[PDB]
Amino acid sequence: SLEVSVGKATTIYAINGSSILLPCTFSSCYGFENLYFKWSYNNSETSRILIDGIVKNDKSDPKVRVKDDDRITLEGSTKEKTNNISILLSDLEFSDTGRYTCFVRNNSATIFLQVVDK
Amino acid sequence: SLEVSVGKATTIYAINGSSILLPCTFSSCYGFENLYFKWSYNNSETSRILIDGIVKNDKSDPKVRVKDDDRITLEGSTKEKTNNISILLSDLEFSDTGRYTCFVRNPLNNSATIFLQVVDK
């Protein structure tokens, strides 16, 4: 049915030492089987995988495949209207400032995360 | 096809005296004809209309119907992969801080939310 979005990208400010939710949802007009998704981190120096996973079908919650940061928790859920593959990043440091890309296969969203003191 | 979103809501910080884009896009697997949309401001006693309009079809850019703030410009466009009905709010003041809602109706309905915080810096 009729869906709305604030876009494929946004900027989030988060507090040093705290946690933050990196939001991403997806949808398909023609269903899906074993959908692959991946969260990655980019800054001007380095790039790396954070977590990836599989959404088996439109009635199964996302499941983690590999994870490269213990501070990350998958916070996904599969419901009638929304396929949620958001992640929680805990114990933030200033070095966590950067671009977070969520890639979905069988498109990409971008979170610009800025870690601040207050 | 395959779409991705950062959600139906976000928070945007903007600078006093400047401008800001309030983003919203919509999608319908069933398509649409003469889709109605409305931007409202919600941190008052009663909600204040900002601008509403119509998207005729998947090949026509959004068009303004009524507008209640001359500081607002529709920045919409209709392309193959994206139905954009964002607006630009110029000449920001601190009183512009609040909740912005973008409502869409297909002749069901849905709504996206922008929490705008105006700061001096």
Residue numbers in the entry:
A (entry chain A): 30 to 135, 143 to 154
B (entry chain B): 30 to 136, 141 to 154
Text of the article:
They consist of a pore-forming α subunit and one or more auxiliary β subunits. Furthermore, the β subunits function as cell adhesion molecules (CAMs).
We determined the structure of the mouse β4 subunit extracellular domain fragment (β4ex) by X-ray crystallography. Unlike the human β4 subunit extracellular domain fragment used in the previous crystallographic study, which had either the C58A or C131W mutation, the present fragment contains all three of the Cys residues. The molecular structure of β4ex is highly superimposable on that of the C58A mutant14, except for the N-terminal region and the mutated residues. The N-terminal region of β4 does not participate in the β-sheet of the Ig fold, and appears to be flexible. In the present β4 structure, this disulfide bond is not formed at a distance of 3.3 Å.
